[PDB]
Amino acid sequence: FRKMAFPSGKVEGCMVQVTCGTTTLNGLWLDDVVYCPRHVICTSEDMLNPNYEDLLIRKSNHNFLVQAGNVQLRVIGHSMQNCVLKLKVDTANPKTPKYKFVRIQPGQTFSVLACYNGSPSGVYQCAMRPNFTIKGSFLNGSCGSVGFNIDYDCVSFCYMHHMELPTGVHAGTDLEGNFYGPFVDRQTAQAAGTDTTITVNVLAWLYAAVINGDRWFLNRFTTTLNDFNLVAMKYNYEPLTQDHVDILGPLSAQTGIAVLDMCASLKELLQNGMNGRTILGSALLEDEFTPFDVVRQC
Amino acid sequence: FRKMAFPSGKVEGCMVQVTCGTTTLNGLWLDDVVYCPRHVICTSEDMLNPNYEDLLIRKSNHNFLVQAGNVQLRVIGHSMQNCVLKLKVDTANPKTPKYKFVRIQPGQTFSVLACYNGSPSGVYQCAMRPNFTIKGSFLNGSCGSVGFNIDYDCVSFCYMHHMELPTGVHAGTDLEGNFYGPFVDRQTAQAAGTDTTITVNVLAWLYAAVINGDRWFLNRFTTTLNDFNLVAMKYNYEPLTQDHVDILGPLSAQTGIAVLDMCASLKELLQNGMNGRTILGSALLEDEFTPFDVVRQCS
């Protein structure tokens, strides 16, 4: 059982390069608009404390160089929506998929298409963590890379990449330009809130380990939902709601293991540890598979 | 570090479905040829021990239903090359990328585009194990899904999926139809060889650790390749080849740590264990990142 990203082709056909001065990042070209992080308009001196409305009023359309491969796209207009710049171009992208912009909830997963110079480089699955960071793999030049899910040929864009934190995790916005989390697009070291574990996802992954044949961690012990949540909070695990229990229904029926019985197994793992043993090859409890992600492979 | 697949779009544009009777699997459409597993021509009764040569004689071009989506591609010729069927079609795929067919070595990684009925469902990174099996997510109907690497817009196709083994792992061929490992395309329980740890990838992992400033395990020793290989086998590690030493060249140059010095450090880890210490925040040595994978995620 491994992490699986959505096929990225529908998004690859939308990636372009956007340059302002000596700052270059990626943009998303949908119909006749290119979306990109607004910090492209900054210089090295601007990034420390940027007044974006002032920086933007001093820009012209011709200050933006947009390249789709080797073809230059003429910028005929520009506006800013929160932390995203919207550049209107004179040509429509014929590869524009059916799409929506969505704001994802913490604990949900999405695929990231990491891009450099407008060229796709890799695809991998991430989760929006409870503290609103993502454990991404992003280097210099990756800004404007997007995260997405795909449902029946429709691409739901949920993330655009803006910055890295000192702990090595990443922060960005939705496609309306609003950050996930208490972060700001300025060149400062920013800490996140406490990184809690996505309990419903851990439970789904334990179910996946059972479907795969592993069950050394199961027990005959029992727990109530409230008593489980008291232990979960003590170990910085997110609360498990009744909705989560309901969502875990299909996995529970398939394995014949009641949700609260799997909660009792997880409680033992938190209290006693794994004792050198591994689950699905991992020495740590994995929390970036949703129940839906598990079902799609099982 | 994380498993990162290549962008799959260039391969998505080559996936089709191939049906004989009620059996549908995936095929790969490049120029005017569709490549797919030859067992598409089998009925359930044929799968125990098919006479593929005899089964193919009873097939004509008009027996093959090849579809890109719902659009049929007319077959104008057919032939068998090892375990792959090649169907010549009347239309050259306009989405054909620059491509090569490569046969990979154990330990090499590649991206799999898992497909069903010619429709891609997901993309993930796989490592070819030393016993020539892969740990994929392959359900019913996944055969003909391909594995690939992409270098400078050129797709190197290296794997086509054919079957599952009783242990839950998977086996397949290159795009010339030659199985990786000692497997055959029949509906029989076949055992893989005992698996071993991919030494060259563990070494790549240790280099990655050094690159990120985690270097407590470096020692003042060196070893010969033969001495290391004899020790490695006692710990169920794969012996190194000359090609392995060569592919570690770039990481050795980046860190200044000779390959054989790193081998000596690994040998010490094998003989002494970790002793509560971690490397890259883990007490377990990772063996599914190649030297190339490490260079990619560092830059």
Side-chain angles (χ1 to χ4, degrees), chain A residues 1 3-43 46-47 49-69 71 73 75-87 89-94 96-97 99 101-150 153-219 222-276 278-295 297-298, chain B residues 1-2 4-47 49-73 75-97 99 101-150 152-219 221-233 235-295 297-299:
Chain A
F1 197 87
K3 268 151 197 188
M4 188 166 318
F6 283 107
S8 61
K10 293 182 165 57
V11 180
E12 294 169 50
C14 300
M15 298 311 303
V16 301
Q17 191 179 31
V18 184
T19 298
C20 199
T22 61
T23 300
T24 294
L25 39 66
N26 306 284
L28 184 69
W29 180 22
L30 302 173
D31 299 312
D32 63 353
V33 176
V34 175
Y35 304 80
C36 73
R38 67 179 174 175
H39 75 255
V40 69
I41 71 181
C42 298
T43 71
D46 291 327
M47 293 187 180
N49 196 322
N51 189 321
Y52 283 108
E53 289 280 17
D54 281 352
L55 293 179
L56 185 61
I57 197 68
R58 305 177 205 265
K59 288 291 175 301
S60 310
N61 287 334
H62 75 272
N63 296 126
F64 299 96
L65 301 184
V66 180
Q67 295 170 247
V71 179
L73 307 180
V75 176
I76 63 173
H78 64 270
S79 62
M80 179 165 67
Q81 179 181 4
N82 305 302
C83 301
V84 159
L85 190 60
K86 295 187 285 192
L87 305 174
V89 290
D90 65 333
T91 57
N93 185 1
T96 304
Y99 75 94
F101 290 168
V102 301
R103 186 165 179 93
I104 40 70
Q105 295 297 302
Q108 292 308 113
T109 57
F110 56 97
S111 295
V112 168
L113 179 66
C115 293
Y116 299 90
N117 304 284
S119 299
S121 70
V123 59
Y124 54 88
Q125 203 79 339
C126 287
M128 181 57 61
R129 304 207 50 83
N131 70 357
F132 293 106
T133 65
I134 70 172
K135 300 182 189 302
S137 292
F138 293 115
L139 303 173
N140 285 339
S142 59
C143 285
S145 297
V146 297
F148 60 98
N149 284 282
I150 300 185
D153 279 354
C154 180
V155 179
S156 289
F157 294 104
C158 61
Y159 178 83
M160 181 169 277
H161 184 52
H162 293 243
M163 60 190 294
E164 184 195 14
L165 306 193
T167 61
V169 302
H170 298 99
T173 66
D174 61 22
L175 272 292
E176 294 181 351
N178 285 317
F179 264 89
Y180 294 98
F183 310 107
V184 174
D185 51 341
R186 60 163 64 173
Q187 188 79 21
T188 57
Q190 298 172 50
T194 298
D195 185 23
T196 52
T197 302
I198 308 158
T199 308
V200 67
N201 288 2
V202 176
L203 291 170
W205 177 76
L206 293 176
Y207 277 108
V210 164
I211 299 177
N212 190 253
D214 296 3
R215 38 204 305 159
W216 65 268
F217 51 88
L218 294 185
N219 60 34
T222 184
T223 184
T224 70
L225 183 60
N226 181 78
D227 291 341
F228 172 76
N229 281 330
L230 291 174
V231 179
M233 284 171 63
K234 186 188 179 191
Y235 288 87
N236 264 327
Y237 269 56
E238 287 289 297
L240 197 74
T241 69
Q242 184 59 42
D243 291 353
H244 290 149
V245 175
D246 295 349
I247 293 170
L248 290 168
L251 291 174
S252 181
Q254 174 172 343
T255 60
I257 302 180
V259 177
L260 293 177
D261 285 331
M262 192 68 82
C263 290
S265 299
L266 175 52
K267 185 192 293 178
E268 189 185 17
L269 288 166
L270 300 176
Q271 289 173 338
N272 301 344
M274 295 173 58
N275 308 332
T278 68
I279 298 167
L280 291 177
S282 172
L284 300 171
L285 297 178
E286 297 276 19
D287 79 334
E288 302 203 354
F289 289 102
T290 67
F292 172 73
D293 294 341
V294 173
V295 175
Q297 288 184 59
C298 285
Chain B
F1 289 85
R2 76 192 310 124
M4 198 168 321
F6 288 100
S8 60
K10 290 174 173 58
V11 179
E12 291 171 59
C14 301
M15 297 310 303
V16 300
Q17 45 186 329
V18 182
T19 300
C20 282
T22 61
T23 304
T24 300
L25 40 64
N26 307 282
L28 184 71
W29 180 19
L30 299 166
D31 297 314
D32 63 349
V33 180
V34 172
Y35 303 79
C36 73
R38 64 176 176 175
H39 75 257
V40 70
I41 74 186
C42 294
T43 65
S44 60
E45 305 80 43
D46 297 320
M47 289 185 174
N49 188 25
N51 190 317
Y52 284 108
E53 293 76 16
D54 204 333
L55 292 169
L56 196 55
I57 280 301
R58 284 165 264 167
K59 285 291 197 165
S60 297
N61 291 331
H62 67 264
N63 293 130
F64 296 95
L65 174 60
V66 178
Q67 295 169 116
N70 293 335
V71 184
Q72 176 174 10
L73 266 176
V75 173
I76 62 175
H78 64 281
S79 62
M80 184 166 59
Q81 177 180 13
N82 305 308
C83 299
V84 152
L85 184 68
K86 296 186 289 193
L87 304 178
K88 188 169 208 61
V89 294
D90 72 359
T91 305
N93 182 359
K95 302 184 209 155
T96 303
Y99 70 97
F101 286 175
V102 303
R103 181 170 183 84
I104 56 166
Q105 301 179 347
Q108 167 73 318
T109 53
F110 53 95
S111 293
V112 172
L113 180 65
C115 288
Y116 301 89
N117 304 286
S119 288
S121 60
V123 63
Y124 55 90
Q125 197 84 339
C126 283
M128 177 72 65
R129 299 309 305 180
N131 65 3
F132 297 100
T133 70
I134 66 173
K135 303 170 186 172
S137 179
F138 289 115
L139 303 179
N140 287 326
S142 60
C143 284
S145 296
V146 298
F148 60 99
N149 286 276
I150 304 183
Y152 310 101
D153 286 71
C154 179
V155 180
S156 289
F157 293 103
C158 61
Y159 180 85
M160 179 165 277
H161 183 54
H162 292 245
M163 63 190 358
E164 178 167 316
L165 298 178
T167 57
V169 300
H170 297 98
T173 65
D174 64 19
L175 269 293
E176 296 184 329
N178 286 311
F179 262 93
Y180 289 100
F183 309 108
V184 292
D185 53 345
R186 311 162 194 167
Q187 191 84 16
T188 59
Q190 298 163 52
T194 305
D195 203 23
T196 52
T197 297
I198 308 165
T199 305
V200 66
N201 290 357
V202 174
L203 289 167
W205 183 249
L206 295 178
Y207 279 108
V210 171
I211 287 164
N212 291 282
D214 199 3
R215 51 181 187 265
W216 61 263
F217 51 86
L218 295 178
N219 59 25
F221 302 145
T222 194
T223 180
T224 68
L225 197 55
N226 183 68
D227 279 340
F228 174 85
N229 277 356
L230 295 172
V231 174
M233 295 196 306
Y235 292 91
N236 216 69
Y237 268 58
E238 191 67 10
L240 291 171
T241 67
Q242 184 61 42
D243 285 352
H244 289 157
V245 172
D246 294 340
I247 66 171
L248 287 163
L251 286 169
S252 176
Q254 180 175 354
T255 60
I257 302 169
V259 174
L260 288 171
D261 294 2
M262 192 66 88
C263 286
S265 294
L266 174 54
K267 179 193 298 179
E268 180 170 326
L269 290 178
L270 296 180
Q271 295 176 329
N272 311 345
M274 305 279 286
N275 290 22
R277 302 214 59 168
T278 57
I279 297 178
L280 289 166
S282 179
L284 286 77
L285 300 169
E286 170 70 42
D287 82 340
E288 298 212 336
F289 291 112
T290 68
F292 179 81
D293 292 325
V294 164
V295 173
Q297 297 190 30
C298 299
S299 51

